[PDB]
Amino acid sequence: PSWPQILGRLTDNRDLARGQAAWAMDQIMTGNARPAQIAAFAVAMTMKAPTADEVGELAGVMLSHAHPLPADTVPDDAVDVVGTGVNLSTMAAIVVAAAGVPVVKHGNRAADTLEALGVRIDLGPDLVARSLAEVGIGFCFAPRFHPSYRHAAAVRREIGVPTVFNLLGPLTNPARPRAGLIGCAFADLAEVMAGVFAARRSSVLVVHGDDGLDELTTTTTSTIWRVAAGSVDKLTFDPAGFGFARAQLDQLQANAAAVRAVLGGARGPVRDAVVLNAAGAIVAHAGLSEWLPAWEEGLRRASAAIDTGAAEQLLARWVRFGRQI
Amino acid sequence: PSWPQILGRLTDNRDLARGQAAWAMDQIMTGNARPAQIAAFAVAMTMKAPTADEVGELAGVMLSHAHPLPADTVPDDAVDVVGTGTVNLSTMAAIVVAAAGVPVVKHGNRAADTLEALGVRIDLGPDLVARSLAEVGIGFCFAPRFHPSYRHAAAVRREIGVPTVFNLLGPLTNPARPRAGLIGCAFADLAEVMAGVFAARRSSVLVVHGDDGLDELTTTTTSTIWRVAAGSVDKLTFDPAGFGFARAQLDQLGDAQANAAAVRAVLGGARGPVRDAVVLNAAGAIVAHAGLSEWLPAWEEGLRRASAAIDTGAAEQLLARWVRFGRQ
Ligand SMILES: O=C(O)c1ccccc1Nc1ccc(OCCCCP(=O)(O)O)cc1C(=O)O
Ligand SMILES: O=C(O)c1ccccc1Nc1ccc(OCCCCP(=O)(O)O)cc1C(=O)O
After folding, report:
1. B231 Rama class: left (phi>0) / alpha (psi -120 to 50) / beta
2. Which of B7, B48, B160 is the closest to A36 by Cβ?
3. Does A11 touch chain B (CB under 8 A)?
4. E strands, chain A, in order
5. What is d(CA B9, CA B50) in angstroms, rounded to the nearest whole number?
6. Measured at the alpha carbon of residue B241, what is the angle toward residues B235 and B247, in degrees to the nearest 5?
7. Distance between CA atoms of B266 and A5, rounded to whole angstroms?
8. Do A161 and B3 touch (CB under 8 A)?
9. Which H helix or E strand runs over B228?
10. Cα A48 to middle of ligand 1, angstroms
């Protein structure tokens, strides 16, 4: 295999042969790729239109190089709550964890929201494991678990344009949770991302707000690719069906204040959006083992996690956990 | 403008707005583009099939930055003989055309190697290329010497390896700006684009693509010719069998050392498929030359002039004189 071979195939608008995407990603992560080669690959794959097989190979290589969490430290039913791209997902994650569903998130700075809240984001595998056990939630700092991806990440920022690489974050949570609510801002790639989760037998709702959000929106309908039993089912979701009023898009350090307000019981469109996304994660969680009863239960659990103060308390306990390390 | 804007537009499979390709090329040519940005643009512009307007803007920026030849040193009827990539055929055809009395000014880069092997000094500044054109009847613009700020793009092209839109610009960024030529293109889809760019400049060009894939007029089969003249483009099918040329095989048409030997053989009068191809392509450039000011009569004359340039020894002498020039 070679870069001219692989780049040539892509520029010819052909799908890659089995293993080729993997070879490319492994070159990129073993420091064997020039920035120009990385950029050419990211762009060419994007314009060719990536397959789930291809994106799967990319994510597979990344996870093969990643620092794992220690053995038997991630519950079988842990979930992620995240988008391709953060205020809504951070809150939803806390609420989901507070409802009793273990959450392990994965991210990087532009993570900023959590720091502003007093959470310690840069922990190693053993301490993330302890956080997950003792608090019910953990955060994997992406640079710390994916050191070899730094070359790729640098090129991402240099070219600016979105590419297939924008999918890899949610697909390479180093804790490897089997479930989640996953936002995707790119309607065409959402389906591909869903296929990758399907191949892994994950239980995920891949969500794309029809207003463009990488979260379940309250301003209008959302497209959901429901992934369960290795298959993908495409659905349109209307929050009005669960009694939610339509919000305006503009209503959705600043984030930290917003987090404190919602967890404190503030009513409004932000809370509604948090509750909706938290419920989505809980439905995805239920999928590891009916759509309407599942959503109704998810919504009850999410609302109760806030209203009882459990979500607010969990964040406080999370903050305290880090200050005691 | 900005890279996110232009690259986003290209990845969305949209043609660029007026000026955007120019802006991009200019960033690249002023050392203001990161290698990753250069590469992303090269690939995106390639996979979003480039338009004549866009390719014209790229070449235009390149020429706006290039060292020109001194005023009035390039004859109004000078021609180019070149392919996008057959360096053996175009090199020989170029010498033959010059020997027939049509000024030739070429533009090229090392992978030029064949000419050096023949003892020609290829790396000359504008003033000496001009002198070469006047005194010998042929000149060569060595690309790094005229396009110095292209070096960042050059490095990126080596790194990614695959052909891109940048592979199309060579015939369109000749710093001597000849107004006529025989221009080969290996990709038929882009040949029509190249013809469009030449038409915009009102060049008299034959853009040629062998139906066997050669970036020359072939003798193995027919060729497609985009005939550019009067700012308008006519697309034609061309069969050299109509001029009595025997069919050759693709294998009959090497490194710079071998190419030089082949050059010496042809200019020395060796008959065969290689000579035929040279004569045919030399004739084509002569036909393009005539178009600056009737199709079959033009070809018949072009073929007579090319054959005679070889057979009298004029072509062989011109090369000897070209080599002599560099040493004096
Ligand atoms: O930004 C991304 O696209 C990304 C996606 C998945 C995982 C990580 C990502 N980013 C990075 C990964 C590594 C990295 O660089 C690692 C530095 C850590 C050094 P050490 O080996 O000592 O832990 C930087 C980034 C980044 O976003 O800037
Ligand atoms: O490669 C370098 O980094 C370099 C360094 C110093 C001086 C020249 C350099 N390279 C070039 C600079 C300009 C240039 O200009 C080429 C323009 C024409 C391209 P084409 O013949 O393919 O149409 C080509 C090169 C090169 O190394 O290839």
Report:
1. left
2. B160
3. yes
4. 79-83, 103-107, 137-141, 179-183, 203-209, 222-228, 231-237
5. 13
6. 115
7. 36
8. yes
9. strand B223-229
10. 26
Rounded CA separation B206/B97 (Å): 15
d(CA A140, CA A121) in angstroms, rounded, equals 7
- Pick the atom of ligand 1 nearest to A147's CA: 16
Which among B196, B147, B203 has a CA at the least distance from the CA of B168? B196
Strand partners, A232: A227
Q: Which residues pair with A207 in a beta bridge?
A: A183, A224
Whole-angstrom distance, CA of residue B1 vs CA of residue A70: 48
Helices B3-11 and A35-48: crossing angle, nearest 10°? 40
Strand partners, A180: A80, A204
- The residues near A117 (Cβ < 8 Å, ≥ 6 apart) are A256, A259, A260, A315, A319
B27 contacts in A (CB within 8 Å)? none
DSSP A87-136: HHHHHHHHHHHHTT--EEEEE----HHHHHTT------HHHHHHHHHHTS
Query: How far apart are alpha carbons B199 and B100 in whole angstroms?
Result: 26
Domains of chain A plus CATH, in order, are 1-66 (1.20.970.10), 75-325 (3.40.1030.10)
**Cβ atoms B40, A40 nearer than 8 A:** yes
- Which contiguous run of DSSP H or E holds residue A316? helix A310-323
Residue A147 CB neighbours (<10 A): 12
Residue B199: both structure tokens together: 């038409």
Which of B208, B197, B184, B110 is CA-nearest to residue B154? B110
The token pair at A264 is: 């404190």
Resolution in A: 1.8
Question: Which pair of structure tokens corresponds to residue A31?
Answer: 């420091």
Burial tier of A281 (Cβ tally within 10 Å: 0-12, 13-18, 19+): buried
